[model samples]
Target: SGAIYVGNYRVVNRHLATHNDWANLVWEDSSRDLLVSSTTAQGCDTIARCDCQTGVYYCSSRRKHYPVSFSKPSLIFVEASEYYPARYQSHLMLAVGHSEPGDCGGILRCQHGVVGIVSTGGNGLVGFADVRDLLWLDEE
Candidate 1:
């Protein structure tokens, strides 16, 4: 049947330039080994890698690649709205956060024009940053 749609994230390469402070975002497949996102700081393109093993997140743009680190592992959740324009289509919300203490998550709005997703967490608003894409990986 042509109805079921199974799609994966579109992966770009290191050769791509970071036009803005936020360049691109990508996910590590299957193993949950690494969750990577890119940012440009101090005129350098840095890569943020979240290690699922040790529950640690860090970034390396120019100096040693682990210049900065977060207290805990990153968390991401996505929910699709029931209303869809067509078959297998609907609105989406991508939530991103951390498991660290005293942390509130952020969200990404994956619809029409890709924008930020907002929600109530902790004491105020929370969501992810520079979310250019979203992917749904189901269990076996």
Candidate 2:
């Protein structure tokens, strides 16, 4: 009962972050327009610790329906930090070279910690929101 429809995205839980930017991770409001995803429609698949690691990882979403491979996600984070704002500090980058619009709000993992969420991707690269804390937003 705590779910609603925002454009085409499935908006389930809601957060208390007041700033408009905070909502960027979940969905975009019209002002445009958004799951724990599991094997079917229950709980998430088998999960482990919460430490993101280097190497190859894969992400699957209701949009993609299939897993897409992402390699060396660690370095991708660095590159994003350099050219992006502080809000993107905890995100991840990937050149999956595939359209990720539907997969934007999905999860990316490596059999261990969740690497990040499918945030944005296009023009050969994609962004992932690794965390939802503004603690470092003004650290600089």
Candidate 3:
């Protein structure tokens, strides 16, 4: 309907998987440089990061936005603190360790490429937010 903001960057388009998936895919251009924002240097990383490796797994995500849990700690590892993208296909991806650490807007990267977005959690449980579906979305 309208626009959304991820940090300081203004999202150009938004896609929401409303039915079962709750995570929203927001796209932004770092080069655009908003009016009030000076210096063309974008705040976050410039990579759109949707180019996920299809066959590779071993996922990991850097997390933030903590309120009640530990002060400042991040990163989550699926499966055996290593990671996985299958075996738990019927539902979301499950990982090791507690849920407090890795659950936020940070996208999960499998090995060398982006795979999914960090999602809802319960004892390291996170939905597989496949970015492959959003590959067709081009901002250029």
Best by TM-score: 2
Pairwise TM-score winner, candidates 2 and 3: 2
Off by over 4 Å in 2: 1-90, 132-140
Candidate 3 has its poorest 10 consecutive residues by lDDT at: 29-38
Worst 10 residues of 1 by lDDT: 58-67
Model 1 lDDT tens row, 1-140: 00011132222211221343124454432211113333232222112222211112211111111111112223434222121112221122222332111221121212222222121122221222322233231111
Q: What value of lDDT does candidate 3 attain over all alpha carbons?
A: 0.30
1-140: candidate 2 lDDT, tens digit per residue: 12222223333212222343344444432210113111112332323234434423333432233344543323232232222332323234454544344544455555553444555555666554443221221121
Off by over 4 Å in 3: 1-92, 138-140
RMSD of 1: 15.5
Q: Which candidate is the best by lDDT?
A: 2
In the predicted model 1, the residue pairs found to clash are: 46-61, 60-65, 105-127, 106-126, 106-127, 106-128, 107-127, 107-128, 109-117
What TM-score does model 3 achieve against the real structure?
Answer: 0.32
Taking the candidates one at a time, how many backbone clashes does each contain? 9, 5, 0
Give the TM-score of each candidate. Answer: 0.19, 0.37, 0.32
